[PDB]
């Protein structure tokens, strides 16, 4: 400050200007990175590759910035993204957004607990009405459009178009299989990004999907005992002397035959502990192959930590380098342990089907991956929507046919709860309009224009904004029946959280 | 830890992919610059496409990368496209950027694009000519035109013809690849521009003249083909070894050995099976005896891509080690002949098992005129094969573009607002192609393609610009010949890419 | 490896006979002391090599500065095989260890 | 390397022959007004010539006529 | 180091070895000219001419200049002996230059063979030093005062001494380090160590064989190498012997006393020996 | 990524296209001036045509970096009009640049240039002689083999080289087919005798392996013993240790030596020569033995040499002395050691009338620095006698066909007209600068004289004159004997019009950044 000391940068000003500015900041894409979105983002993540997406998250926490303003928000975005899978693209812009209202406020020189109290009790008067918002609940798991009615909505508030036959696959890769009953799995049904096929070739098998080629033969057993290991081969032979092969004429002997009969011991110590399929992080080697050929144990020649991990945590296997002979802990569990070509890949598939404990293994096959892992974004995030853990899941207008109702609902009731609190109450009511403009963004019109109309729709909880132009001239697209609802749950965090660090971000002047 | 975002990001986007657009520009005509691309190589790197230098590219905007994959894309996939997708996104992109300030921003950017590239592939696939066997032709006599076409382009004698229908035939036996590879020109420097085979087998411009290769059949026809990676020298056992002398039978000892191991090794992969040794790399003077002292003919310092070519249509294995012995890491032709031809001394590997390499020998020996004709064939390669590949054919200078954008700017009227604005930018999109051409075929960009558009507002069956005759007409009765899927291929990146990076103002990166 | 310890080896070899010298050095400049003051009372031999011969003063005398080139030759010649050797084994260790490690 | 036109050689190959052409007419016949030789990365060393086969040694030249011509001297 | 005044310190330093003296008078004689020079230069007058006018009138001068002077008798050595006293009187230095000039006058009257006297080379003169006795004690002798002197038994003051020098190796050869053994074991180099010891004795004892008085020997590291044990019996061959002196004062000693430069057994007979009535170190004073 | 105008790189090019056309222009033929190159090294050293300075000058921009590319070709095949590309390229390049600032196109006019050559080459195809004949050629090589040996190294004409360099080709000449290489005759660069003292070899000279003289020098037959192995007990030409038992054992060691002389001299002999070249080097103890027990043989011998002659003899080397043959053995229609320089052993010369493919004119020289200018002369007379053999056609040019060519072009651009016919009326000027630019490195004002023989191309079309390339008053090409193989200016029409059109390649004048980086 004025003294040498105070450690700080936020505060006052820079409080009321450049925190909730940076605030400001990161909430303007989001923005275009919810409800159905046409924009897009680059994004180099210290790859330098570039990767395109509609989703805040993914990039935010690459963004570095002074200020834990935005450190902070991200973490009930997270925590949003933690509990729901989508419309966390949404649960910055509104915060940031209703948190103007505040230093328009503070040029209006309203009170920190003044701004604050206001949306608090609008958001439970919110968190009251909003449940009575819920225009309808999900249902049937087992049915396929069911869940990917829904589905669309989170993918569309990623991607407006592939949404169709995504939803539908996404079902098809059975969320059902688990009840989602106090109960889903995402590594059980991990998406597995197969390149090459087509995008919309990306397939469902139940059971784990590893494009690593399949090596061996097919498993021992299908209910194989799989022992997992990091590095099972960090060789047999040793790099050692001269040439980094060898030094001495004599040393090329003992080198090429002792990485046979270890690999040998080592793969029949595979048969000996008993696994079915061999899993090497480490190297391939032919020989070994051939003990695993000869041992029948199914092998893999290379591992991602993703394989060995999702190994390690469904098999119930245990990655661990054997120079060793092998020790089954890792044990077996999928009862179906296969070699498999999907997309014609070599694809390692274990596969075992229980009510909770059932890999159903989401596969894509797909044409480009910088495509197919923002294609897995959506159908991840959208599985995450899914991943309510209510079957019925009290939905609510998706894509925001909601904000309208509660536009209307609150500030008009706003003014009902007098004292100057009501104009916080007030200005609750207003950054409902965020995603009706931010499609209106990407659909290119005015909020005003939507809000106009979108009040003129009055008590809809259907007509809305999305894309296209019936975004745009009447901003009238139903979300409630586009087929698009969303859950209050996902709905309900996003009012409540972005309540919260909104409300605390303000609170800190140092 | 970066990022970007809003107009004054987008167009800066924009900004770089209207730069790099020029040098595909002309780049097919061969009239205009070139640019000799020394790296920290050190070393000249001259192009006829950009897709050469895009390699050799390394961009300050990512965005400029992200064409140059979809550029790189239909190029590498077609084997040329890159001057088609790279200036169809810097079009729409140069076209928006005025727009860009009133906006197209809204992502209704797109909707435009789709539809755009929608219309004209059914408008192309109507306007793609199919072709087939004895349909309207002989498939070599389609081919032949096809041939004749690019043979045609930049002038050459009648032997246009000439090499048309013959390059028709390798291509009618090895016909897979749209590529030329398993048929690829053998240039000759010697002989004459009448002189020119295509061979159906693999056929080696080069191997050296050794000592004792005069002693080395230049004739098998069996030949057991030994495809040698590595040198079998003098230096294999070196022959300079001291000895100590109380007589002088130890001098005669260490010398009369140490030159039999360079024997040795040699005869085993000989005695096993090879009259026919390929080393891509030197051989000994001492050990081309012991090559030609068993008269086995052996061939050091030969083409890699003749020796790979060998593995392909001789069904040889390339071999790394004589110490290997093997009669199937060789490889059966059944003619190994070597004539000669003008100064290279010269294999005729034929009657290989399969034989799934063919090349065209060109001769005449004259630099200036084969390279032309080399470049010319390549394309005549490139339309027969692909011709084939997709029979369904389109004439090229232009000939749907002046169409397709009144076709397409018919449909404009009906929008007006941001997207018939593209309508008629996606209109106009077209006439760039031409456009450089009328630089190169000494026309007037402003003048001629309007009267494509009236060609194609009077005629509109193909009538467009002839590079190649310097006239305008149909292309398609000027020959101008081309699939019209590369061009429906030509559409899908158009307003891919375009569609593509446009949506992106919003960039983040991080560095960190 | 073999290479390292051979050259070591002659070193401490010549190293130590060179050091017994010393004393004999001592013993070599006590033997010019104790010749010298022998004017032939007790029958003085050389000792020098295996043959005890039948010796003269003289002959006594001129071999103790003939025996001090012992301590002279076997000390000076060594410092040269000190590090005649030293060096060779000092530069071979690196060599042939990283090999054999790498 | 530095292609040299006879722009750029005449006057090159002037200055040093030419100047250089004064050092040994400078110290010349009976009255030859001596030198001192500039001995050059070597101390001073100050030596004091007749003869100018001592001054194309002492100082290095590269005036390609002065190069050339310590040969023609 | 600039190049005029490079030549400026040879200005006196000529003069310093010219007359040994007046070497303040050839620098200041310098500017005087070198005025002058400028001046005709300034003049335009052409540095030959301006040098060609010079050496010409110096001649002329000279003798003008010795159209002053007064000779005195060279030959005399009194008269030369009030002279350069008188000299040394139209100097400073006085206190033991009046001592000292008889002991010079007379040094240069040994060294005054002429009635001319010609140059008096300090040549032939050996200034030498003794750390004791005094300026009293500062004394002319008429055989080379040699530094030190080296014995072993060798004898302590030989009369008629013939003087030996040593420019050969006493050192038996070295094929390894200083000794004629090779350094592998102990036992195959106390054979060539016994070769070693004879050929120092023998090189020593044919030294004697053709014999000397004294031997001059220069440094070891004026040498090669000397081998002791040669020595430790050379001088207990009885001789007279200085070791470690000057191959420089050494060409004084050969020249002054006549002991020519030796490098071999043959080069001693008489010969290249200066022959020493007597040899004696002086501890004294 | 740095992208400039190709206007700005033409300007980087025509700033290129300059000083290497420029160094030509006073270094024009003898009245041209000598090229200086001083080194890395700093090493002064006088140069000639192109190629040579072309490569010795470090080419920077593109175009001196093409420059040499192209450079090359003419003196390969031709061995002269190498300093006129560079010349012609600026010349009608610096032109097509004040085109291109007319606002030209550089495509269109180029072809025109394209176009223009052929009517010139054509044009050329009207001029001279299309004939020369084995001895007719020799006086017009004569007129070359004057200029050529009039030029470089001396420009007295020794008709030594002269006779003997068309000799080493017209004996290969014939040989492959009315061609011939310059592997296939050589310049033999070896001193000890003057630029006088030359030689036409068959095949290989090499100086014979003698450890000593009365040890008798024997050479004869026709044939030389090819042998990587001895012909006299081995050694790889380095150290060897000969030691033996007792004081008599040296004396039983020569009788091994004395024997396995003949032992192998017995062997090698029969399957042809006595004449064993040996690559292996022995001491001079054997050597000599065997120089003294018979028939000596060649030791310390490069191993390309005992190939050498070997290829040369069309047969092999023998490998291994427990092997031989005849075929591995020489085939030479003369072996003969002949006393090789005046300083030195004699010569061991192997002249190969059983099979050469090479015949190989040798050049003693009384410095290295003559011995190789003359070197450097022979192989451009050397190689216009290989345009001949395969076409003996002939042109006179240089003043007379320039401006020849360049005036049908220049009627060809009005009757052709557009883009050709500034192409056209620029394409003849720049041929019409040679000239000219002769009367530029000459003593003559390069215009007048370009008037002058314009003068006379108005008189009379093809002339047996032209300007004067000697400078003598008189101006003539038959009596000048100035010309060129019609294969050669063609060739040499070819190679700037190929590389102007080169600058005009595609399109892409961008770099990633790199271009020159």
């Known amino acids: 400050m004025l003294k040498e000391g105070a450690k700080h940068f936020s505060g006052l000003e820079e409080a009321v200007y450049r925190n909730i500015q940076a605030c400001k900041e990161l909430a303007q894409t989001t923005r275009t990175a919810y409800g159905p979105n046409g924009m897009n983002k680059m994004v180099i993540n210290h790859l330098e590759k570039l990767f395109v997406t509609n989703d805040a998250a993914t990039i935010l926490r690459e963004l570095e910035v002074q200020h834990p303003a935005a450190k902070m928000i991200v973490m009930a975005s997270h925590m949003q993204e933690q509990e729901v899978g989508d419309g966390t693209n949404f649960v910055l812009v509104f915060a940031g957004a209703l948190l103007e209202l505040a230093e328009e406020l503070l040029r209006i020189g309203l009170s920190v607990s003044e701004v604050i109290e206001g949306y608090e009790i609008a958001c439970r008067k919110a968190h009251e009405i909003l449940p009575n918002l819920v225009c309808c609940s999900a249902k049937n798991l087992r049915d396929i459009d069911e869940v990917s009615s829904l589905l669309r909505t989170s993918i569309m508030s990623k991607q407006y178009g592939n949404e169709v036959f995504l939803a539908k696959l996404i079902a098809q890769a059975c969320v059902s299989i688990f009840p989602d009953s106090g109960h889903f799995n995402v590594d059980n049904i991990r998406v597995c990004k197969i390149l090459g096929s087509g995008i919309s070739s990306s397939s469902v098998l139940h059971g784990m999907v590893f494009k690593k080629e399949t090596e061996g033969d097919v498993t021992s057993v299908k209910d194989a005992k799989i022992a997992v290991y990091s590095c099972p081969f960090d060789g047999m032979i040793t790099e050692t002397k001269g040439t980094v092969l060898i030094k001495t004429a004599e040393e090329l002997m003992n080198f090429s035959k002792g990485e046979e009969n270890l690999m040998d011991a080592q793969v029949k110590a595979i048969a000996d502990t008993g696994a079915n399929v061999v899993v090497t992080g480490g190297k391939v080697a032919d020989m070994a192959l051939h003990y695993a050929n000869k041992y029948n144990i199914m092998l893999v020649r290379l591992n991602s930590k993703w394989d060995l991990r999702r190994l390690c945590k469904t098999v119930g296997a245990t990655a661990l380098p054997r120079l060793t002979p092998p020790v089954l802990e890792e044990m077996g569990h999928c009862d179906s342990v296969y070699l498999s070509e999907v997309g014609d890949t070599q694809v390692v598939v274990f596969k075992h089907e229980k009510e909770d404990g059932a890999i159903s293994t989401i596969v894509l096959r797909g044409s480009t991956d910088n495509l197919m892992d923002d294609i897995e974004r959506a159908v991840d995030d959208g599985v995450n929507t899914f991943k309510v853990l209510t079957r019925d899941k009290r939905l609510v207008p998706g894509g925001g046919a909601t904000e309208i109702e509660l536009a209307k609902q609150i500030t008009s009731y706003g003014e009902t709860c007098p004292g100057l609190e009501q104009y916080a109450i007030k200005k609750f009511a207003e950054a409902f309009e965020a995603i009706p403009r931010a499609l209106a963004e990407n659909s290119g019109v005015k909020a005003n224009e939507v809000i106009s109309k979108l009040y003129a729709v009055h008590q809809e909880g259907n007509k809305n904004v999305g894309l296209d132009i019936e975004a745009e001239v009447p901003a009238v697209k139903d979300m409630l029946e586009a087929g698009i609802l969303d859950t209050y749950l996902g709905k309900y965090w996003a009012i409540k959280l972005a309540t919260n660090a909104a409300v605390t971000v303000l609170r800190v002047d140092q | 830890t970066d990022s970007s975002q809003g107009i004054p990001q987008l167009v800066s986007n924009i900004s770089a992919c209207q730069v790099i657009a020029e040098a595909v520009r002309t780049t097919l005509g061969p009239r205009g610059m070139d640019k000799l691309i020394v790296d920290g190589r050190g070393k000249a790197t001259i192009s006829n496409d950009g897709a050469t230098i895009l390699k050799l590219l390394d961009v300050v905007h990512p965005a400029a990368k992200t064409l140059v994959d979809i550029a790189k894309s239909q190029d590498a996939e077609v084997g040329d496209g890159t001057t088609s997708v790279t200036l169809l996104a810097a079009e729409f992109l140069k076209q928006v950027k005025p727009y860009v300030e009133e906006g197209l921003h809204p992502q209704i950017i797109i909707r435009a694009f789709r539809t755009a590239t929608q219309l004209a592939v059914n408008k192309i696939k109507e306007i793609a000519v199919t072709v087939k066997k004895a349909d309207k032709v002989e498939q070599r006599k389609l081919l032949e035109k096809c041939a004749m076409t690019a043979l045609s382009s930049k002038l050459i004698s009648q032997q246009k013809a000439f090499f048309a229908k013959m390059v028709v035939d390798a291509v009618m036996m090895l016909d897979d690849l749209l590529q030329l590879k398993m048929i690829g020109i053998k240039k000759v420097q010697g002989g004459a521009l009448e002189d020119s085979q295509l061979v159906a087998g693999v056929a080696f411009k080069k191997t050296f003249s050794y000592a004792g290769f005069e002693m080395q059949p230049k004739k098998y026809h069996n030949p057991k083909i030994a495809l040698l990676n590595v040198e079998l020298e003098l230096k294999a056992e070196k022959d300079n070894a001291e000895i100590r002398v109380h007589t002088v039978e130890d001098y005669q000892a260490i010398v009369d050995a140490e030159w039999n191991i360079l024997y040795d090794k040699l005869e085993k992969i000989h005695h096993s099976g090879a009259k026919v040794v390929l080393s891509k790399l030197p051989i000994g003077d001492v050990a081309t005896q012991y090559f030609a002292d068993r008269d086995m003919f052996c061939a050091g310092r030969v083409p890699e891509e003749d020796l790979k070519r060998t593995m392909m249509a001789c069904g040889g294995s390339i071999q790394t080690s004589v110490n290997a012995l093997s009669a199937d890491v060789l490889g059966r032709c059944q003619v190994f002949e070597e004539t000669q031809i003008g100064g290279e001394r010269y294999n005729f590997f034929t009657g290989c098992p399969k034989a799934k390499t063919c090349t065209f020998i060109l001769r005449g020996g004259a630099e200036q005129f084969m390279e032309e004709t080399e470049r010319s064939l390549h394309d005549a390669i490139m339309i027969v094969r692909r011709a084939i590949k997709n029979d369904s054919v389109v004439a090229g200078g232009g000939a749907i573009e002046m169409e397709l954008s009144k076709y397409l700017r018919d449909y404009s009227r009906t929008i007006p607002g941001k997207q018939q604005l593209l309508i008629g930018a996606y209109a106009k999109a077209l006439e760039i192609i031409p456009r450089q051409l009328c630089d190169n075929a000494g026309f007037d960009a402003t003048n001629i393609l309007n009267k494509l558009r009236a060609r194609h507002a009077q005629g509109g069956t193909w009538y467009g610009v002839d590079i190649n005759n310097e006239d305008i007409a149909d292309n398609f009765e000027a020959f101008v010949w081309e699939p019209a899927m590369v061009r429906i291929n030509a559409l899908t990146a158009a307003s891919e890419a375009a569609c593509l990076i446009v949506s992106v103002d919003e960039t983040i990166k991080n560095p960190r | 490896v073999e290479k390292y310890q051979q050259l070591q080896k002659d070193l401490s070899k010549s190293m130590s006979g060179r050091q017994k010298l010393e004393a004999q050095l001592t013993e070599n400049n006590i033997v010019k002391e104790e010749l010298a003051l022998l004017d032939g009372s007790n029958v003085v031999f050389k000792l020098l090599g295996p043959v005890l011969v039948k010796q003269e003063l003289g002959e006594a005398r001129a071999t103790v500065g003939k025996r001090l080139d012992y301590i002279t030759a076997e000390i000076k010649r060594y410092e040269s095989q000190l590090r005649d050797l030293e060096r060779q084994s000092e530069q071979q260790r690196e060599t042939l260890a990283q090999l054999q490690q790498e | 390397a530095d292609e040299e036109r006879a722009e750029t050689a005449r006057l090159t190959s002037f200055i040093g022959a030419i100047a250089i052409g004064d050092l040994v007419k400078s110290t010349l016949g009976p009255k030859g007004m001596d030198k001192i030789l500039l001995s050059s990365g070597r101390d001073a060393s100050l030596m004091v010539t007749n003869d100018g086969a001592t001054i194309l040694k002492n100082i290095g030249v590269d005036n390609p006529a002065a190069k050339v011509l310590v040969d023609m001297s | ?285 | 990524k740095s992208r400039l105008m190709g206007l700005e790189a033409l300007k980087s090019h025509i700033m290129a296209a300059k000083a290497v056309a420029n160094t030509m222009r006073t270094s024009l033929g003898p009245n041209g001036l000598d090229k200086m190159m001083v080194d890395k090294d700093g090493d002064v050293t006088v140069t000639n045509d192109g190629a040579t300075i072309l490569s010795m000058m470090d080419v920077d921009h593109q175009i001196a970096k093409l420059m040499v590319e192209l450079s090359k070709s003419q003196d390969d095949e031709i061995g002269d009009g190498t300093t006129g590309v560079v010349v012609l390229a600026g010349a009608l390049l610096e032109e097509a640049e004040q085109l291109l600032d007319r606002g030209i196109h550089p495509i269109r006019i180029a072809d025109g240039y394209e176009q223009a050559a052929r009517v010139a080459i054509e044009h050329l195809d009207k001029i001279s002689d299309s004939v020369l004949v084995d001895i007719k050629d020799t006086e017009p090589l004569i007129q070359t083999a004057k200029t050529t040996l009039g030029s470089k190294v001396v420009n007295s004409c020794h008709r030594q080289m002269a006779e003997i360099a068309v000799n080493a080709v017209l004996t290969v000449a014939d040989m492959e087919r009315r061609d011939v290489d310059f592997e296939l005759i050589k310049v033999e660069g070896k001193v000890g005798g003057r630029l006088e003292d030359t030689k036409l070899i068959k095949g290989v000279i090499v100086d014979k392996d003698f450890s000593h003289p009365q040890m008798p020098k024997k050479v004869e037959d026709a044939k030389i013993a090819i042998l990587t192995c001895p012909f006299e007990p081995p050694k790889p030409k380095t150290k060897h240790k000969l030691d033996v038992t007792s004081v008599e054992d040296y004396k039983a060691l020569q009788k091994y030596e004395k024997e396995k002389f003949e032992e192998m001299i017995q062997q090698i002999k029969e399957t042809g020569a006595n004449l064993a070249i040996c690559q292996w080097g022995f001491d001079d103890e054997a050597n000599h033995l065997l120089l003294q027990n018979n028939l000596p043989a060649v030791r310390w011998v490069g191993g390309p040499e005992i190939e050498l002659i070997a290829i040369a003899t069309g047969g092999r080397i023998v490998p291994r002395f427990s092997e031989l043959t005849a075929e591995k053995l020489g085939f030479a229609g003369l072996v003969q050691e002949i006393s090789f320089g005046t300083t030195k052993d004699k010569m061991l010369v192997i002249e190969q009338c059983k099979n050469s493919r090479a015949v190989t004119i040798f050049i003693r020289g009384g410095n290295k620095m003559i011995i190789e200018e003359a070197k450097r002369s022979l192989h451009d007379a050397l190689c216009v006698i290989r345009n001949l053999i395969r076409d003996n056609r002939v042109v006179y040019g240089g003043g007379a066909a320039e401006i020849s060519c360049a005036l049908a072009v220049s009627q060809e651009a009005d009757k052709c007209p557009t883009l050709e016919q500034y192409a056209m009326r620029a394409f003849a000027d720049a041929l019409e600068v040679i000239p000219m630019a002769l009367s530029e490195n000459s003593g003559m004002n390069p215009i007048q004289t370009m008037t002058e023989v314009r003068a006379r191309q108005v008189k009379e079309m093809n002339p047996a004159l032209g300007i004067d390339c000697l400078h003598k008053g008189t101006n003539d090409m038959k009596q000048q004997h100035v010309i060129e193989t019609l294969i050669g200016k063609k060739q040499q029409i070819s190679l700037a019009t190929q590389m102007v059109r080169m600058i005009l390649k595609i399109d892409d004048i961008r770099k990633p950044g790199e271009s020159e980086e």
């Not at chain 5, 180091?1 to 400026?8: T, V």
């Not at chain 5, 002429?114 to 002319?140: F, M, Q």
């Not at chain 5, 090669?224 to 012997?241: G, Q, Y």
Request: net charge negative; proline share 2%.
């Open chain 5, 1 to 285: 180091l600039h190049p005029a005044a490079r030549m400026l310190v040879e200005l006196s330093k000529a003069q310093d070895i010219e007359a040994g003296d007046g070497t303040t008078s050839v620098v200041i004689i310098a500017g005087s000219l070198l005025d002058s020079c400028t001046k005709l230069l300034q003049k335009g007058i052409h540095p030959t001419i301006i040098s060609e006018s010079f050496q010409k009138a110096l001649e002329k001068g000279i003798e003008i200049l010795t159209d002053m002077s007064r000779p005195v008798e060279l030959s005399d050595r009194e008269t030369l002996l009030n002279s350069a006293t008188t000299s040394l009187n139209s100097k400073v230095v006085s206190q033991y230059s009046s001592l000292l000039s008889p002991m010079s006058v007379n040094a240069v009257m040994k060294v005054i063979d002429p009635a001319t006297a010609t140059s008096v080379d300090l040549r032939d003169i050996k200034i030498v030093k003794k750390l004791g006795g005094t300026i009293d004690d500062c004394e002319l002798v008429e055989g080379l005062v040699l530094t030190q002197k080296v014995s072993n038994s060798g004898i302590t003051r030989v009369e008629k001494a013939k003087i030996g020098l040593i420019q050969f190796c006493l050192s038996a050869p070295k094929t390894d380090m200083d000794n004629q053994i090779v350094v592998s074991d102990y036992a195959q180099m106390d054979r060539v160590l016994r070769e070693e010891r004879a050929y120092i004795l023998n090189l020593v004892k044919q030294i004697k064989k053709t014999g000397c008085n004294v031997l001059l020997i220069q440094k070891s590291i004026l040498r090669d190498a000397l081998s002791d044990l040669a020595l430790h019996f050379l001088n207990k061959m009885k001789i007279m012997v200085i070791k470690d002196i000057e191959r420089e004062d050494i060409e004084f000693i050969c020249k002054t006393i006549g002991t020519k430069p030796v490098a071999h057994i043959d080069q001693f007979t008489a010969d290249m020996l200066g022959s020493a009535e007597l040899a004696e170190e002086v501890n004294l004073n």
